[PDB]
Amino acid sequence: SSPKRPYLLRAYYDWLVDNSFTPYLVVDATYLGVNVPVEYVKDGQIVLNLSASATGNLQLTNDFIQFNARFKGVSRELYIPMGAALAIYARENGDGVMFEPEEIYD
């Protein structure tokens, strides 16, 4: 069967937004195929605010997360392979999920 990660990602994203929390996505910036501003990468990772307010055209698909965001006013198109998505949680209280290390992503 396919990985459960993308389904759980969508579930927690909606739960976070519906509860007025700001969804923060933790990404492994070293993962193959990741496209993010390297200047904002720290400790091999990057945290991204996925709220509709901080993004544009957000897509949460099975194999990837894609959206536009701004950095110091500059707009860029981010692309995150699902295997690089490590967790999603509330900026406000830390509630969310740290994804299980599903084999298929290794």
């Binding site: 904002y40 991204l48 965001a69 701004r70 950095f71």
Partner: peptide, 11 residues
């Protein structure tokens, strides 16, 4: 002093 995310709060 709480650190936020990398991208700007508003797109």
């Amino acid at each position: 002093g709480r650190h936020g995310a990398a991208n700007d709060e508003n797109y």
